[PDB]
Design an enzyme around this catalytic site. Structure first.
Site, PDB file in Angstrom:
ATOM      1  N   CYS A 118      -2.887  10.113  -4.865  1.00 20.92           N
ATOM      2  CA  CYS A 118      -2.283   9.854  -6.069  1.00 20.92           C
ATOM      3  C   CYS A 118      -3.457   9.782  -7.210  1.00 20.92           C
ATOM      4  O   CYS A 118      -3.071  10.205  -8.455  1.00 20.92           O
ATOM      5  CB  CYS A 118      -1.907   8.142  -5.918  1.00 20.92           C
ATOM      6  SG  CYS A 118      -3.197   7.237  -5.771  1.00 20.92           S
TER       7      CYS A 118
ATOM      8  N   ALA B 139       0.724  -1.200  -0.085  1.00 19.61           N
ATOM      9  CA  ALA B 139       0.086   0.140  -0.048  1.00 19.61           C
ATOM     10  C   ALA B 139       0.821   1.128   0.038  1.00 19.61           C
ATOM     11  O   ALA B 139       2.038   1.223   0.327  1.00 19.61           O
ATOM     12  CB  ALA B 139      -0.787   0.011   1.165  1.00 19.61           C
TER      13      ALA B 139
ATOM     14  N   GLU C  99       3.844  14.815 -11.381  1.00 18.41           N
ATOM     15  CA  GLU C  99       3.054  14.992 -10.606  1.00 18.41           C
ATOM     16  C   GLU C  99       3.233  15.401  -9.362  1.00 18.41           C
ATOM     17  O   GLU C  99       4.274  15.147  -9.091  1.00 18.41           O
ATOM     18  CB  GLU C  99       2.190  13.471 -10.394  1.00 18.41           C
ATOM     19  CG  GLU C  99       1.015  13.579  -9.430  1.00 18.41           C
ATOM     20  CD  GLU C  99      -0.254  14.170  -9.821  1.00 18.41           C
ATOM     21  OE1 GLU C  99       0.082  15.477 -10.250  1.00 18.41           O
ATOM     22  OE2 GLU C  99      -1.394  13.745 -10.048  1.00 18.41           O
TER      23      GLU C  99
ATOM     24  N   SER D  40       3.569   5.078  -7.308  1.00 17.35           N
ATOM     25  CA  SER D  40       4.271   5.902  -8.443  1.00 17.35           C
ATOM     26  C   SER D  40       4.375   5.282  -9.848  1.00 17.35           C
ATOM     27  O   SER D  40       4.101   3.978  -9.715  1.00 17.35           O
ATOM     28  CB  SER D  40       5.880   6.931  -8.151  1.00 17.35           C
ATOM     29  OG  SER D  40       6.596   5.712  -7.891  1.00 17.35           O
TER      30      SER D  40
END
EC number: 1.2.1.27
Lengths: 470, 485, 439, 463
Positions: free
Chosen positions: B283, B149, B383, B228
């Site tokens: 995210c 996670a 990002e 990512s």
């Protein structure tokens, strides 16, 4: 030329019957004999049963997709010959061409619904529910099925009874209406043209004797019926006596409730359309109107709207309702109206003495509106099966709900109102499954039988529990 | 020296790790070391794998009904201990209490969805397709599964990984985020109290070495990861080179098109909340939006709405924007802001300099706005994973659609517009199936699979839905012809 | 005089290629040039892709019911021309008429399966199909009908060695009322696959057969970002228990192992005689000898010739390597001589026994009428041998005991297990195919 | 001093009945009166119906999730008090402690299954698919021998939103009282469940009373048909889960030891007082030669009180059952059949006055004998024989009633042939009892039964 015979359909040939009893097919708009249907003999019915039995194994071994292709091609052919079936219906049963087209369209809808059964035929399985124990179930055909239609929809009734039994893998022995078999014959022809294996469908015309035969013979695994409550329960009991399963639509005594807060124009329009549509011969149709509160003031407007209906033969352009099926039906409707009048009911509109130009010899009955009716009157208890609208008056919605619940035979009901809370209250309190808010007949398709119910009826559920160890 | 440590979950029982390497757990509102987490050694990981293997046969023989009953008890315990989980999340991750509540609610919804997999585990059958030819279909568990996670969701991602893997008959070896493990430990305690047999779930820790072991160990049948792009690709490769199936939901720079014919104030509030909610660390955050025509005139209103956010610690009342999880995150955010400045992008509002009264020691970063951005800017390529709202210059809907399509990594997209034809045209030409109208970020709906195949996702299967079952189970079809004349 | 030239299919009309790379195609029963196939030029492929693009909007806007009716009319046309298609396949591919009729029947079956796509939702766009020489008729009907009915336009690149069958199929499809430009067909060698993978217009690609070719295509697609459902081939291991029906089991083995000369994508080319089943080798050899080897068009034939002389050379080299490595050849067909067709690529049924798992014949894909036989003493050994196969898609177990079949199905790692039946589910795709062709 | 008196359960209050007519409860191991069950009076039954009516609105307004949590708490309580329920069952019905524990576990599994109704219950023209409860439900229990069944009836009726009026077995009430106490402790609203005891009069009231919407019954076919008719007469929707005779076919290639053990366990298990018992066996082919080993395995069974350790089968519920079994065995004997093992003269040490009947095996029986037509409901196994599978299949099909059937064999072809050619629904392969659950065709059918569908069609608009 004269009295053209109506042939049977056994195996793959349109064999003609050699019976002694014959019934004349009269045009309801002119009472002129247009055909003669024979009462199939015992030997012919036995041959049809033998053909169904011989076709059962091959048709059952056929894959579900292979069967469904036949139904798809049959639906396509029906769509191609819509006009022919519509004209045959208009000629035999006398309904307007638009009504026949709508009936064939509903039949096409039901055929598509049956074609959509391919997925449901699969069975579930549970591997290793316990140590080395597997579980799975199968759905297999029952055997030879049958259907009966005394005088109701000629095409839609077969188009819901036979295609489902076919998709389920069974063979069907249909006993169409003794008054309108031509539509069923054309449907069987289009089916045989669709490539259906011979013997999968068999058709035998006959009176109550044929119904008794079908109920008695053991090879019939299941039977379907749609009609009056009397004949419905009779066939149900005759079938249960022999163990065979039976399903029957016994009653369509629908009650329409009109609240003061409703669209008067649209409400009256839909009421006039559903009550007198198809001369009220259709099983499902709003026949008992309950006016709650100030809705009673709409009776003159209702009568005025009903006066705007055009009675004429089903083939003449600009027709709203056709003649009755037989003169006996007209005499029965007249007797019922006379009884209602004698019992104290007021006839706001009388069609008993209607006279259609150019078709005075037909079985026409004008829109009849009866008010001041009570639950104890014959008009309320008896099912008219005609263009007669009985209206009762109530003060509160609770009274209307109670009156509707008192109806022993009831499957469809409607309520006209703009208040959603009132509609929800009526739906929760009413003891009817199908309810229509501003809709005259919810789900106009013939049903109490579709979807899971049809499969559960036409197929038996085999369950296998196997525990192999060594 | 020895800050109160966090518990592990080995062999279906909470035990400590013998490792000598520890990672500090910092409170992002004050950077205070609230705990320490040790990276699981080879011994602890081997013991966890052994326990998962031992539990696999019993947990598979365990009827699906009993597993769903256990999942229901777990749902109930979550509903009861909701406040404790919310407090733990707010303390560890730093997000506001409302964000923790929403995370717990989404996890509860995912558990509820997992409880309805009854019809999915059962197989199909078709008897006698031909003469004496019966076909069967079976879905069998795979074995021990692993999950990694991210630092954003110490509750949502664990609650995505546990229900499906457990109800599918598989035993799971979870890896929580070292920066927010306590919430996962409390969730596992509640699960065990719900009746979960010992060994069905195991928890280990480790930054990179544990991931390498999980991807290299053969007993792991499948691996689930979220994070990512580079890390997701590395994990997918390391797993596939060993023959194991892997699914990775990587970074997704979702775009939100702002059409002139939309609710102005509501659209601006939603954009401000999505781009800065939870410090924009999500995210799936809507860190980028597209302003079409008149939408560009509203930039002063964007600045006003950004200033309206109460920049304060997640535990204080009325807090809107939380701090960054670690000082490294704040450093990355400030470096990206400086890069955007150097690229020539108009930073209309800069929260880089804002501080929080009573919490200056925390890694707080105010709401930052960068407008007039185009695909040439580097901040659009990368990002932010922070409280930065990017809006691009556009003139027509087609240009916005093309700009969104140019984004190689994106799983969800939305458009703010009251015109149905506008949304239809947007969905028809935009390369995204998950389209939302007047919603900043399409809320997960686990009843169907979270489909994704762009650069923002790796693997041919998804986490939940039908694809979830397909991933956590193995389809076996048997054709039998039993005939002896 | 001039050998016939197969034309491409672009814009709803057959057009001849401008390329000079006119490859010559030989008949496998006589190795005589029956036609030539051109390698489409860059310009022709670009024009085909442009036509597919221009046609995609209209075909996608078309209702599902219209596409279903088109597919039904196409199935009808095939049914009416089944004999011609079978004769063309036999003349072009060499397999017996019965095999071609079976291929057409599987085509009809997959078309009917596609007809069940009434509604499940959108089409992706331009789709591509790469087919090897294993199945000229089935593979097209596997790929293009699904993408078509789903609303996508398809670009099919059939096998360079057998384009005629799919060409007649596309003619019949156009006769079914298919809009022009919806389906496009091109021909070419590895360069064509390179183009199809590089040109970004193609959004999806379908390929089957060779393993390394499928891997290369999948890698190139992932490089260019295209959906590739590369269902590569795999060997099939059959286990025979002593309690299985000897006659029926041997007949099934002989049919599946040598049917269609073993050239099909997947066949039961491996047999594991566990227990006393090894004693059945004489009956197996006798049944294999009973097979008739002759041209696909001559009456009384069970297996046709190989696709090309190179295939025969490769099969002979593999058999020689197996023999030299230590395997005993129970039946040898390398030097068979068919009367009147000695020049063909015919190869008689070959049976190999005593083969160890580490031998070449066990690892290499034969793609020919060769059957390798192994022996074991316990079913666990056979299960382990089957599991050791890295690329195993199908597996079969012959036995009359239910417990044995259940244990084999549960312990075996293969996904498809056919108990008492070889080559289970020869079709695989499905609803996952719909998901593939949609978004 | 005096024996305890069973008390009713009305409005959540355990109230003792004021009736004059009473019935005694005897321990089947010693025939000693251990309790009394009263004949519920008309007034008490009316009060119970009124309580159910008053509770139906609240219990229906409650969401399905609350009812699910209540069922979960009740399941937990059952798991806690499993030993007490097993002891009460062994005391009243005589079943062995292991059999009672298995019954409790099967009831727990049925409750778990009922808990899975979470979403299935929820169910310009709009088309709603609302499913609503029926009202006050009822459940008559067996008129021969009980076996679980409350947990089959009332948990589903409650989770579906309906109120239940339970008519437990007048011969084994205590288990129902303990289950009702546990349910009330589970947080169930008062009046949701009501229990009344009585003879045929109670069944007549339940069937004739108008407030009752649905009825469920298990047991013999006679009482089932009677209740079905009496309910359909008053418009009641009733499902008659009637028991039926079962037939197990044995092939020469089946596992000898395992097949014999499973037959001995399913035939003489629980004294054969179950509708699921495999009371008949058909030895096909050379299977006839297995009779000696079958008789030996039957002899190996040890008969003793359900509470004494090492008991395989318990005594019958009432002496009348023993008399009926003896009469039915004597009839088969007189009709020409032979008894390989005689159990009439069984005399348990220390329980000579109990209703014990030892394992009985009858051979050479034909389909025309009373033993084949009548349901024994006892430890009697009639063994038939045939020469081909077709004869066994035809014999199984000739039987009018039937729900379970088993085939013992190792060849898959024979098993598939039997499963396809047999006319029975549930077919077990190497399994004596295919499904010890309330199928009796409750799953989706139960959901459809305990709920009424309403397809609300509406053309409503803002006008």
């Amino acid at each position: 030329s004269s009295v053209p015979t109506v042939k049977l359909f056994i195996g793959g040939k349109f064999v003609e019957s050699k019976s002694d009893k014959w019934i004349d097919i009269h045009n309801p708009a002119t009472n002129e004999v247009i055909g003669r249907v024979p009462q199939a003999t015992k030997a012919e019915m036995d041959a049809a049963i033998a053909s169904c039995k011989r076709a059962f194994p091959a048709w059952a071994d056929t894959s579900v997709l292979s069967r469904q292709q036949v139904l798809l091609r049959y639906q396509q052919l029906i769509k191609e010959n819509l006009k022919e079936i519509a004209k045959l219906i208009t000629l035999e049963q006398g309904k307007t061409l638009a009504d026949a087209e709508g009936d064939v369209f509903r039949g096409l809808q039901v055929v598509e619904h049956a074609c959509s059964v391919t997925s449901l035929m699969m069975g579930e399985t549970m591997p290793s529910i316990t140590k080395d124990m597997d579980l799975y179930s199968y759905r297999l055909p029952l055997g030879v099925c049958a259907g009966i239609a005394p005088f109701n929809f000629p095409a839609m009734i077969p188009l819901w009874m036979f295609p489902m039994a076919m998709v389920c893998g069974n063979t069907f022995l249909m006993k169409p209406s003794e008054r309108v078999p031509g539509a069923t014959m054309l449907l069987a022809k289009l089916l045989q043209d669709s490539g259906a294996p011979d013997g999968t469908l068999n058709i035998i015309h006959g009176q109550h004797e044929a119904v008794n035969f079908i109920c008695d013979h053991p090879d019939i695994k299941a039977i379907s019926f749609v009609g009056s409550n009397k004949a419905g329960e009779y066939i149900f009991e005759r079938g249960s006596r022999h163990g065979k399963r039976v399903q029957a639509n016994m009653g369509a005594k629908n009650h329409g409730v009109v609240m003061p807060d409703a669209n008067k124009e649209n409400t009256l329009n839909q009421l006039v359309g559903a009550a007198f549509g198809a001369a009220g011969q259709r099983c499902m149709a709003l026949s008992t109107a309950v006016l709650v509160g100030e809705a009673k003031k709409w009776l003159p407007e209702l009568v005025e709207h009903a006066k705007n209906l055009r009675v004429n033969a089903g083939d003449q352009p600009g027709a709203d309702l056709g003649p009755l099926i037989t003169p006996q039906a007209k005499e029965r409707v007249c007797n019922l109206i006379d009884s209602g009048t004698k019992e104290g009911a007021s006839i706001l509109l009388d069609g008993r003495k209607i006279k259609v130009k150019g078709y005075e010899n037909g079985n026409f009955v004008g829109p009849t509106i009866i008010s001041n009716v009570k639950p104890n009157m014959t008009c309320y208890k008896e099912e008219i099966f005609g263009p007669v609208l009985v209206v009762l008056e109530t003060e509160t919605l609770d009274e209307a709900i109670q009156i509707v619940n008192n109806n022993p035979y009831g499957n469809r009901t409607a309520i006209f109102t703009t208040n959603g809370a009132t509609a929800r209250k009526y739906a929760h309190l009413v003891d009817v499954g199908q309810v229509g808010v501003n809709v005259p007949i919810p789900v106009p398709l013939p049903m109490f039988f579709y979807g899971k119910q049809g499969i559960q009826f036409y197929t038996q559920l085999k369950t296998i529990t196997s525990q192999w160890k060594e």
